[PDB]
Amino acid sequence: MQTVIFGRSGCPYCVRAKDLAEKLSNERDDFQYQYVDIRAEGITKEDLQQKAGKPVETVPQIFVDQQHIGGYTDFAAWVKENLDA
């Protein structure tokens, strides 16, 4: 599916979500990922806040096609109990 990482380049934080999503992207031939940045490209915390589900002031965040998962933690966990095959 389409996994999207919306993080803050510069910090070794999104790196985990990208690596995970990426690795998955290769472990499973049906998985693709996208690294989108909030400043580098120009996104607004408002729009994101809206599409994520009011994550107040917490980054980075991961999205899955249409649903929002949360932070790298939720992403790793989500992955574990979803792509365990």
List the beta bridge partners of residue 7. Answer: 37
Length of the chain: 85
67 is in which domain, residue-wise? 1-85
DSSP 38-85: STTTT--HHHHHHHHT--TT---EEEETTEEEESHHHHHHHHHTT---
Angle between helices 14-27 and 72-80 (to 10 degrees): 20
Q: Please pick, among 7, 33, 35, 72, the residue that the annotation labels catalytic.
A: 72
33 classed as catalytic:
no
* Helical (H) or strand (E) element with 3: strand 2-7
Q: Hey, what are 16's tokens? A: 């985990």
11 classed as catalytic:
yes
- CB-side neighbour CA atoms (13 Å) of 33: 20
CATH for 60: 3.40.30.10
For 10-29, b where at least 16 C-beta lie within 10 A, e where not — what string? Answer: eeebbebbbebbbebbeeee
71 classed as catalytic:
no
Q: Please pick, among 7, 16, 18, 33, the residue that the annotation labels catalytic.
A: 18
Method by which the model was determined: NMR
Phi, psi of 33 (to 5 degrees): -135, 160
14 classed as catalytic:
yes
